[PDB]
mmCIF file with all atom_site columns, C-alpha atoms and ligand atoms in Angstrom:
data_model
loop_
_atom_site.group_PDB
_atom_site.id
_atom_site.type_symbol
_atom_site.label_atom_id
_atom_site.label_alt_id
_atom_site.label_comp_id
_atom_site.label_asym_id
_atom_site.label_entity_id
_atom_site.label_seq_id
_atom_site.pdbx_PDB_ins_code
_atom_site.Cartn_x
_atom_site.Cartn_y
_atom_site.Cartn_z
_atom_site.occupancy
_atom_site.B_iso_or_equiv
_atom_site.pdbx_formal_charge
_atom_site.auth_seq_id
_atom_site.auth_comp_id
_atom_site.auth_asym_id
_atom_site.auth_atom_id
_atom_site.pdbx_PDB_model_num
ATOM   1   C  CA  . UNK W 1 1   ? 23.731 -16.274 129.032 1.00 0.00 ? 1   UNK W CA  1
ATOM   2   C  CA  . UNK W 1 2   ? 24.372 -19.121 131.456 1.00 0.00 ? 2   UNK W CA  1
ATOM   3   C  CA  . UNK W 1 3   ? 27.740 -17.817 132.644 1.00 0.00 ? 3   UNK W CA  1
ATOM   4   C  CA  . UNK W 1 4   ? 28.080 -20.740 135.049 1.00 0.00 ? 4   UNK W CA  1
ATOM   5   C  CA  . UNK W 1 5   ? 26.881 -23.404 132.623 1.00 0.00 ? 5   UNK W CA  1
ATOM   6   C  CA  . UNK W 1 6   ? 23.969 -25.834 132.687 1.00 0.00 ? 6   UNK W CA  1
ATOM   7   C  CA  . UNK W 1 7   ? 22.693 -27.826 135.704 1.00 0.00 ? 7   UNK W CA  1
ATOM   8   C  CA  . UNK W 1 8   ? 24.629 -31.033 136.405 1.00 0.00 ? 8   UNK W CA  1
ATOM   9   C  CA  . UNK W 1 9   ? 24.406 -34.025 138.737 1.00 0.00 ? 9   UNK W CA  1
ATOM   10  C  CA  . UNK W 1 10  ? 26.102 -33.171 142.051 1.00 0.00 ? 10  UNK W CA  1
ATOM   11  C  CA  . UNK W 1 11  ? 26.822 -36.665 143.437 1.00 0.00 ? 11  UNK W CA  1
ATOM   12  C  CA  . UNK W 1 12  ? 28.502 -37.561 140.139 1.00 0.00 ? 12  UNK W CA  1
ATOM   13  C  CA  . UNK W 1 13  ? 30.569 -34.337 140.261 1.00 0.00 ? 13  UNK W CA  1
ATOM   14  C  CA  . UNK W 1 14  ? 31.641 -35.177 143.818 1.00 0.00 ? 14  UNK W CA  1
ATOM   15  C  CA  . UNK W 1 15  ? 32.618 -38.724 142.784 1.00 0.00 ? 15  UNK W CA  1
ATOM   16  C  CA  . UNK W 1 16  ? 34.624 -37.416 139.821 1.00 0.00 ? 16  UNK W CA  1
ATOM   17  C  CA  . UNK W 1 17  ? 36.519 -35.001 142.076 1.00 0.00 ? 17  UNK W CA  1
ATOM   18  C  CA  . UNK W 1 18  ? 37.181 -37.518 144.878 1.00 0.00 ? 18  UNK W CA  1
ATOM   19  C  CA  . UNK W 1 19  ? 40.935 -37.308 144.238 1.00 0.00 ? 19  UNK W CA  1
ATOM   20  C  CA  . UNK W 1 20  ? 40.818 -33.595 145.094 1.00 0.00 ? 20  UNK W CA  1
ATOM   21  C  CA  . UNK W 1 21  ? 38.627 -34.037 148.179 1.00 0.00 ? 21  UNK W CA  1
ATOM   22  C  CA  . UNK W 1 22  ? 41.459 -35.472 150.275 1.00 0.00 ? 22  UNK W CA  1
ATOM   23  C  CA  . UNK W 1 23  ? 44.990 -34.348 151.207 1.00 0.00 ? 23  UNK W CA  1
ATOM   24  C  CA  . UNK W 1 24  ? 46.833 -32.394 150.095 1.00 0.00 ? 24  UNK W CA  1
ATOM   25  C  CA  . UNK W 1 25  ? 44.148 -30.348 148.264 1.00 0.00 ? 25  UNK W CA  1
ATOM   26  C  CA  . UNK W 1 26  ? 41.127 -31.166 150.414 1.00 0.00 ? 26  UNK W CA  1
ATOM   27  C  CA  . UNK W 1 27  ? 38.520 -29.018 148.695 1.00 0.00 ? 27  UNK W CA  1
ATOM   28  C  CA  . UNK W 1 28  ? 37.242 -27.884 145.331 1.00 0.00 ? 28  UNK W CA  1
ATOM   29  C  CA  . UNK W 1 29  ? 35.284 -24.783 144.379 1.00 0.00 ? 29  UNK W CA  1
ATOM   30  C  CA  . UNK W 1 30  ? 32.409 -25.608 142.023 1.00 0.00 ? 30  UNK W CA  1
ATOM   31  C  CA  . UNK W 1 31  ? 32.091 -22.411 139.958 1.00 0.00 ? 31  UNK W CA  1
ATOM   32  C  CA  . UNK W 1 32  ? 34.662 -19.689 139.300 1.00 0.00 ? 32  UNK W CA  1
ATOM   33  C  CA  . UNK W 1 33  ? 34.233 -15.897 139.381 1.00 0.00 ? 33  UNK W CA  1
ATOM   34  C  CA  . UNK W 1 34  ? 30.775 -16.067 140.933 1.00 0.00 ? 34  UNK W CA  1
ATOM   35  C  CA  . UNK W 1 35  ? 29.454 -13.988 143.819 1.00 0.00 ? 35  UNK W CA  1
ATOM   36  C  CA  . UNK W 1 36  ? 28.412 -17.161 145.629 1.00 0.00 ? 36  UNK W CA  1
ATOM   37  C  CA  . UNK W 1 37  ? 31.499 -19.168 146.515 1.00 0.00 ? 37  UNK W CA  1
ATOM   38  C  CA  . UNK W 1 38  ? 30.340 -22.765 146.399 1.00 0.00 ? 38  UNK W CA  1
ATOM   39  C  CA  . UNK W 1 39  ? 32.863 -25.312 147.673 1.00 0.00 ? 39  UNK W CA  1
ATOM   40  C  CA  . UNK W 1 40  ? 32.912 -29.021 148.481 1.00 0.00 ? 40  UNK W CA  1
ATOM   41  C  CA  . UNK W 1 41  ? 35.256 -29.842 151.347 1.00 0.00 ? 41  UNK W CA  1
ATOM   42  C  CA  . UNK W 1 42  ? 36.475 -33.373 151.937 1.00 0.00 ? 42  UNK W CA  1
ATOM   43  C  CA  . UNK W 1 43  ? 38.838 -34.972 154.412 1.00 0.00 ? 43  UNK W CA  1
ATOM   44  C  CA  . UNK W 1 44  ? 40.624 -35.943 156.399 1.00 0.00 ? 44  UNK W CA  1
ATOM   45  C  CA  . UNK W 1 45  ? 41.822 -32.586 157.723 1.00 0.00 ? 45  UNK W CA  1
ATOM   46  C  CA  . UNK W 1 46  ? 42.451 -31.289 161.215 1.00 0.00 ? 46  UNK W CA  1
ATOM   47  C  CA  . UNK W 1 47  ? 43.571 -27.725 161.909 1.00 0.00 ? 47  UNK W CA  1
ATOM   48  C  CA  . UNK W 1 48  ? 44.296 -25.266 164.712 1.00 0.00 ? 48  UNK W CA  1
ATOM   49  C  CA  . UNK W 1 49  ? 43.341 -21.940 163.137 1.00 0.00 ? 49  UNK W CA  1
ATOM   50  C  CA  . UNK W 1 50  ? 40.020 -20.204 163.756 1.00 0.00 ? 50  UNK W CA  1
ATOM   51  C  CA  . UNK W 1 51  ? 38.302 -18.308 160.941 1.00 0.00 ? 51  UNK W CA  1
ATOM   52  C  CA  . UNK W 1 52  ? 36.602 -14.950 161.495 1.00 0.00 ? 52  UNK W CA  1
ATOM   53  C  CA  . UNK W 1 53  ? 34.362 -14.550 158.423 1.00 0.00 ? 53  UNK W CA  1
ATOM   54  C  CA  . UNK W 1 54  ? 32.742 -11.101 158.055 1.00 0.00 ? 54  UNK W CA  1
ATOM   55  C  CA  . UNK W 1 55  ? 29.810 -12.740 156.247 1.00 0.00 ? 55  UNK W CA  1
ATOM   56  C  CA  . UNK W 1 56  ? 27.651 -15.837 156.840 1.00 0.00 ? 56  UNK W CA  1
ATOM   57  C  CA  . UNK W 1 57  ? 28.674 -19.416 156.058 1.00 0.00 ? 57  UNK W CA  1
ATOM   58  C  CA  . UNK W 1 58  ? 26.234 -22.140 155.013 1.00 0.00 ? 58  UNK W CA  1
ATOM   59  C  CA  . UNK W 1 59  ? 27.092 -25.816 155.554 1.00 0.00 ? 59  UNK W CA  1
ATOM   60  C  CA  . UNK W 1 60  ? 25.401 -28.984 154.310 1.00 0.00 ? 60  UNK W CA  1
ATOM   61  C  CA  . UNK W 1 61  ? 27.279 -32.113 155.365 1.00 0.00 ? 61  UNK W CA  1
ATOM   62  C  CA  . UNK W 1 62  ? 26.465 -34.377 152.421 1.00 0.00 ? 62  UNK W CA  1
ATOM   63  C  CA  . UNK W 1 63  ? 28.652 -37.371 153.218 1.00 0.00 ? 63  UNK W CA  1
ATOM   64  C  CA  . UNK W 1 64  ? 30.342 -38.399 156.444 1.00 0.00 ? 64  UNK W CA  1
ATOM   65  C  CA  . UNK W 1 65  ? 30.667 -36.369 159.638 1.00 0.00 ? 65  UNK W CA  1
ATOM   66  C  CA  . UNK W 1 66  ? 32.637 -33.307 160.715 1.00 0.00 ? 66  UNK W CA  1
ATOM   67  C  CA  . UNK W 1 67  ? 32.600 -30.725 163.485 1.00 0.00 ? 67  UNK W CA  1
ATOM   68  C  CA  . UNK W 1 68  ? 33.380 -27.069 164.068 1.00 0.00 ? 68  UNK W CA  1
ATOM   69  C  CA  . UNK W 1 69  ? 35.329 -25.950 167.097 1.00 0.00 ? 69  UNK W CA  1
ATOM   70  C  CA  . UNK W 1 70  ? 33.822 -22.583 168.019 1.00 0.00 ? 70  UNK W CA  1
ATOM   71  C  CA  . UNK W 1 71  ? 34.059 -19.664 170.386 1.00 0.00 ? 71  UNK W CA  1
ATOM   72  C  CA  . UNK W 1 72  ? 30.514 -18.886 171.547 1.00 0.00 ? 72  UNK W CA  1
ATOM   73  C  CA  . UNK W 1 73  ? 29.681 -16.396 174.299 1.00 0.00 ? 73  UNK W CA  1
ATOM   74  C  CA  . UNK W 1 74  ? 33.346 -16.388 175.321 1.00 0.00 ? 74  UNK W CA  1
ATOM   75  C  CA  . UNK W 1 75  ? 33.647 -20.154 175.724 1.00 0.00 ? 75  UNK W CA  1
ATOM   76  C  CA  . UNK W 1 76  ? 34.940 -23.091 173.694 1.00 0.00 ? 76  UNK W CA  1
ATOM   77  C  CA  . UNK W 1 77  ? 32.088 -24.989 172.064 1.00 0.00 ? 77  UNK W CA  1
ATOM   78  C  CA  . UNK W 1 78  ? 31.635 -27.633 169.387 1.00 0.00 ? 78  UNK W CA  1
ATOM   79  C  CA  . UNK W 1 79  ? 29.035 -27.755 166.630 1.00 0.00 ? 79  UNK W CA  1
ATOM   80  C  CA  . UNK W 1 80  ? 28.707 -31.249 165.175 1.00 0.00 ? 80  UNK W CA  1
ATOM   81  C  CA  . UNK W 1 81  ? 28.096 -31.545 161.436 1.00 0.00 ? 81  UNK W CA  1
ATOM   82  C  CA  . UNK W 1 82  ? 26.654 -35.034 161.275 1.00 0.00 ? 82  UNK W CA  1
ATOM   83  C  CA  . UNK W 1 83  ? 25.876 -36.510 157.875 1.00 0.00 ? 83  UNK W CA  1
ATOM   84  C  CA  . UNK W 1 84  ? 22.722 -34.824 156.608 1.00 0.00 ? 84  UNK W CA  1
ATOM   85  C  CA  . UNK W 1 85  ? 23.029 -31.748 158.834 1.00 0.00 ? 85  UNK W CA  1
ATOM   86  C  CA  . UNK W 1 86  ? 22.673 -28.170 157.635 1.00 0.00 ? 86  UNK W CA  1
ATOM   87  C  CA  . UNK W 1 87  ? 23.903 -25.146 159.548 1.00 0.00 ? 87  UNK W CA  1
ATOM   88  C  CA  . UNK W 1 88  ? 24.124 -21.391 159.059 1.00 0.00 ? 88  UNK W CA  1
ATOM   89  C  CA  . UNK W 1 89  ? 27.013 -19.657 160.835 1.00 0.00 ? 89  UNK W CA  1
ATOM   90  C  CA  . UNK W 1 90  ? 26.489 -15.962 161.695 1.00 0.00 ? 90  UNK W CA  1
ATOM   91  C  CA  . UNK W 1 91  ? 29.205 -13.418 160.774 1.00 0.00 ? 91  UNK W CA  1
ATOM   92  C  CA  . UNK W 1 92  ? 32.312 -13.257 162.984 1.00 0.00 ? 92  UNK W CA  1
ATOM   93  C  CA  . UNK W 1 93  ? 31.719 -16.424 165.014 1.00 0.00 ? 93  UNK W CA  1
ATOM   94  C  CA  . UNK W 1 94  ? 35.212 -17.897 165.278 1.00 0.00 ? 94  UNK W CA  1
ATOM   95  C  CA  . UNK W 1 95  ? 35.292 -21.423 163.846 1.00 0.00 ? 95  UNK W CA  1
ATOM   96  C  CA  . UNK W 1 96  ? 37.864 -24.150 163.282 1.00 0.00 ? 96  UNK W CA  1
ATOM   97  C  CA  . UNK W 1 97  ? 36.482 -26.934 161.075 1.00 0.00 ? 97  UNK W CA  1
ATOM   98  C  CA  . UNK W 1 98  ? 37.671 -30.476 161.765 1.00 0.00 ? 98  UNK W CA  1
ATOM   99  C  CA  . UNK W 1 99  ? 37.080 -33.175 159.207 1.00 0.00 ? 99  UNK W CA  1
ATOM   100 C  CA  . UNK W 1 100 ? 38.298 -36.503 160.532 1.00 0.00 ? 100 UNK W CA  1
ATOM   101 C  CA  . UNK W 1 101 ? 36.773 -38.778 157.891 1.00 0.00 ? 101 UNK W CA  1
ATOM   102 C  CA  . UNK W 1 102 ? 38.091 -39.823 154.491 1.00 0.00 ? 102 UNK W CA  1
ATOM   103 C  CA  . UNK W 1 103 ? 35.384 -39.793 151.812 1.00 0.00 ? 103 UNK W CA  1
ATOM   104 C  CA  . UNK W 1 104 ? 33.437 -37.075 153.600 1.00 0.00 ? 104 UNK W CA  1
ATOM   105 C  CA  . UNK W 1 105 ? 31.974 -34.179 151.640 1.00 0.00 ? 105 UNK W CA  1
ATOM   106 C  CA  . UNK W 1 106 ? 30.495 -30.927 152.843 1.00 0.00 ? 106 UNK W CA  1
ATOM   107 C  CA  . UNK W 1 107 ? 28.814 -28.274 150.746 1.00 0.00 ? 107 UNK W CA  1
ATOM   108 C  CA  . UNK W 1 108 ? 29.994 -24.877 151.970 1.00 0.00 ? 108 UNK W CA  1
ATOM   109 C  CA  . UNK W 1 109 ? 28.517 -21.673 150.575 1.00 0.00 ? 109 UNK W CA  1
ATOM   110 C  CA  . UNK W 1 110 ? 29.943 -18.206 151.195 1.00 0.00 ? 110 UNK W CA  1
ATOM   111 C  CA  . UNK W 1 111 ? 29.907 -14.787 149.511 1.00 0.00 ? 111 UNK W CA  1
ATOM   112 C  CA  . UNK W 1 112 ? 32.729 -12.905 147.813 1.00 0.00 ? 112 UNK W CA  1
ATOM   113 C  CA  . UNK W 1 113 ? 33.923 -10.196 150.188 1.00 0.00 ? 113 UNK W CA  1
ATOM   114 C  CA  . UNK W 1 114 ? 33.819 -6.600  148.939 1.00 0.00 ? 114 UNK W CA  1
ATOM   115 C  CA  . UNK W 1 115 ? 37.014 -4.554  149.052 1.00 0.00 ? 115 UNK W CA  1
ATOM   116 C  CA  . UNK W 1 116 ? 37.623 -3.392  152.608 1.00 0.00 ? 116 UNK W CA  1
ATOM   117 C  CA  . UNK W 1 117 ? 35.786 -6.294  154.188 1.00 0.00 ? 117 UNK W CA  1
ATOM   118 C  CA  . UNK W 1 118 ? 38.537 -8.439  155.715 1.00 0.00 ? 118 UNK W CA  1
ATOM   119 C  CA  . UNK W 1 119 ? 38.701 -12.032 156.930 1.00 0.00 ? 119 UNK W CA  1
ATOM   120 C  CA  . UNK W 1 120 ? 40.530 -12.938 160.107 1.00 0.00 ? 120 UNK W CA  1
ATOM   121 C  CA  . UNK W 1 121 ? 42.535 -16.042 160.890 1.00 0.00 ? 121 UNK W CA  1
ATOM   122 C  CA  . UNK W 1 122 ? 43.723 -16.646 164.393 1.00 0.00 ? 122 UNK W CA  1
ATOM   123 C  CA  . UNK W 1 123 ? 45.100 -19.059 166.963 1.00 0.00 ? 123 UNK W CA  1
ATOM   124 C  CA  . UNK W 1 124 ? 44.380 -19.390 170.682 1.00 0.00 ? 124 UNK W CA  1
ATOM   125 C  CA  . UNK W 1 125 ? 46.537 -20.669 173.492 1.00 0.00 ? 125 UNK W CA  1
ATOM   126 C  CA  . UNK W 1 126 ? 45.792 -24.238 174.605 1.00 0.00 ? 126 UNK W CA  1
ATOM   127 C  CA  . UNK W 1 127 ? 47.014 -23.370 178.118 1.00 0.00 ? 127 UNK W CA  1
ATOM   128 C  CA  . UNK W 1 128 ? 45.183 -20.139 178.972 1.00 0.00 ? 128 UNK W CA  1
ATOM   129 C  CA  . UNK W 1 129 ? 42.828 -19.558 176.045 1.00 0.00 ? 129 UNK W CA  1
ATOM   130 C  CA  . UNK W 1 130 ? 44.230 -16.135 175.179 1.00 0.00 ? 130 UNK W CA  1
ATOM   131 C  CA  . UNK W 1 131 ? 44.509 -14.989 171.558 1.00 0.00 ? 131 UNK W CA  1
ATOM   132 C  CA  . UNK W 1 132 ? 48.024 -15.842 170.336 1.00 0.00 ? 132 UNK W CA  1
ATOM   133 C  CA  . UNK W 1 133 ? 48.077 -14.346 166.837 1.00 0.00 ? 133 UNK W CA  1
ATOM   134 C  CA  . UNK W 1 134 ? 45.632 -12.870 164.326 1.00 0.00 ? 134 UNK W CA  1
ATOM   135 C  CA  . UNK W 1 135 ? 46.108 -12.018 160.657 1.00 0.00 ? 135 UNK W CA  1
ATOM   136 C  CA  . UNK W 1 136 ? 43.551 -10.088 158.604 1.00 0.00 ? 136 UNK W CA  1
ATOM   137 C  CA  . UNK W 1 137 ? 43.401 -10.663 154.864 1.00 0.00 ? 137 UNK W CA  1
ATOM   138 C  CA  . UNK W 1 138 ? 41.433 -9.360  151.878 1.00 0.00 ? 138 UNK W CA  1
ATOM   139 C  CA  . UNK W 1 139 ? 40.466 -12.813 150.689 1.00 0.00 ? 139 UNK W CA  1
ATOM   140 C  CA  . UNK W 1 140 ? 40.478 -12.875 146.875 1.00 0.00 ? 140 UNK W CA  1
ATOM   141 C  CA  . UNK W 1 141 ? 41.681 -16.429 146.289 1.00 0.00 ? 141 UNK W CA  1
ATOM   142 C  CA  . UNK W 1 142 ? 41.943 -19.111 148.980 1.00 0.00 ? 142 UNK W CA  1
ATOM   143 C  CA  . UNK W 1 143 ? 44.617 -20.935 146.968 1.00 0.00 ? 143 UNK W CA  1
ATOM   144 C  CA  . UNK W 1 144 ? 47.188 -18.086 146.981 1.00 0.00 ? 144 UNK W CA  1
ATOM   145 C  CA  . UNK W 1 145 ? 46.085 -15.849 149.871 1.00 0.00 ? 145 UNK W CA  1
ATOM   146 C  CA  . UNK W 1 146 ? 45.796 -18.465 152.635 1.00 0.00 ? 146 UNK W CA  1
ATOM   147 C  CA  . UNK W 1 147 ? 48.474 -21.194 152.692 1.00 0.00 ? 147 UNK W CA  1
ATOM   148 C  CA  . UNK W 1 148 ? 51.360 -18.716 153.112 1.00 0.00 ? 148 UNK W CA  1
ATOM   149 C  CA  . UNK W 1 149 ? 49.504 -17.117 156.031 1.00 0.00 ? 149 UNK W CA  1
ATOM   150 C  CA  . UNK W 1 150 ? 49.285 -20.446 157.863 1.00 0.00 ? 150 UNK W CA  1
ATOM   151 C  CA  . UNK W 1 151 ? 52.849 -21.386 156.879 1.00 0.00 ? 151 UNK W CA  1
ATOM   152 C  CA  . UNK W 1 152 ? 54.204 -18.115 158.308 1.00 0.00 ? 152 UNK W CA  1
ATOM   153 C  CA  . UNK W 1 153 ? 52.575 -18.816 161.670 1.00 0.00 ? 153 UNK W CA  1
ATOM   154 C  CA  . UNK W 1 154 ? 53.981 -22.358 161.876 1.00 0.00 ? 154 UNK W CA  1
ATOM   155 C  CA  . UNK W 1 155 ? 57.471 -21.100 161.033 1.00 0.00 ? 155 UNK W CA  1
ATOM   156 C  CA  . UNK W 1 156 ? 57.606 -18.390 163.717 1.00 0.00 ? 156 UNK W CA  1
ATOM   157 C  CA  . UNK W 1 157 ? 57.948 -19.052 167.451 1.00 0.00 ? 157 UNK W CA  1
ATOM   158 C  CA  . UNK W 1 158 ? 57.360 -15.309 167.922 1.00 0.00 ? 158 UNK W CA  1
ATOM   159 C  CA  . UNK W 1 159 ? 53.970 -15.481 166.211 1.00 0.00 ? 159 UNK W CA  1
ATOM   160 C  CA  . UNK W 1 160 ? 53.184 -18.663 168.141 1.00 0.00 ? 160 UNK W CA  1
ATOM   161 C  CA  . UNK W 1 161 ? 54.131 -17.263 171.559 1.00 0.00 ? 161 UNK W CA  1
ATOM   162 C  CA  . UNK W 1 162 ? 51.207 -16.533 173.845 1.00 0.00 ? 162 UNK W CA  1
ATOM   163 C  CA  . UNK W 1 163 ? 51.382 -12.922 175.095 1.00 0.00 ? 163 UNK W CA  1
ATOM   164 C  CA  . UNK W 1 164 ? 49.591 -13.921 178.324 1.00 0.00 ? 164 UNK W CA  1
ATOM   165 C  CA  . UNK W 1 165 ? 51.376 -17.022 179.629 1.00 0.00 ? 165 UNK W CA  1
ATOM   166 C  CA  . UNK W 1 166 ? 54.317 -17.350 177.234 1.00 0.00 ? 166 UNK W CA  1
ATOM   167 C  CA  . UNK W 1 167 ? 53.423 -20.852 176.055 1.00 0.00 ? 167 UNK W CA  1
ATOM   168 C  CA  . UNK W 1 168 ? 54.514 -21.406 172.458 1.00 0.00 ? 168 UNK W CA  1
ATOM   169 C  CA  . UNK W 1 169 ? 51.615 -22.725 170.350 1.00 0.00 ? 169 UNK W CA  1
ATOM   170 C  CA  . UNK W 1 170 ? 52.355 -26.111 168.650 1.00 0.00 ? 170 UNK W CA  1
ATOM   171 C  CA  . UNK W 1 171 ? 51.716 -24.706 165.170 1.00 0.00 ? 171 UNK W CA  1
ATOM   172 C  CA  . UNK W 1 172 ? 50.234 -27.036 162.535 1.00 0.00 ? 172 UNK W CA  1
ATOM   173 C  CA  . UNK W 1 173 ? 49.080 -29.886 164.800 1.00 0.00 ? 173 UNK W CA  1
ATOM   174 C  CA  . UNK W 1 174 ? 47.660 -29.565 168.328 1.00 0.00 ? 174 UNK W CA  1
HETATM 175 FE FE1 . LIG N 2 .   ? 35.025 -20.230 157.345 1.00 0.00 ? 201 LIG N FE1 1
HETATM 176 FE FE1 . LIG N 2 .   ? 48.636 -18.640 177.104 1.00 0.00 ? 202 LIG N FE1 1
#
């Protein structure tokens, strides 16, 4: 049967979930227990962590504008997600999404990761660019598997300390 239910109007769904598409929640997954992880991400939200996804990520910036801070070819780059833009991110490209605008909405589509295929989350030194800390996770649920990871980095000067220049990373806000 239709495990994930009947078709429904997407703009209306987004409107009805507007209260979840802003802090502190910020995002909302559309269907549960599906292979395709379909999420709408709102704003505002700024962050310092970079994601290393072992699979591809599809973006369609439906409302408002956002941007991804990236590492490409060993250098810091920015991919703008202007309203109306689509984008396909290859596996393992490190990315830190920034969503400055309230009322923005981005469709993000990913795949469930098989057992053994791990996600990485990491931070880089603002002073010398060296990797400061990386955690790998078997990502089953973003809601329980991810916030403690971030929280543990912010709470530890050891985790935040650059091994190259010794600068302590700011933590939650750059
Ligand atoms: Fe990601
Ligand atoms: Fe450093």
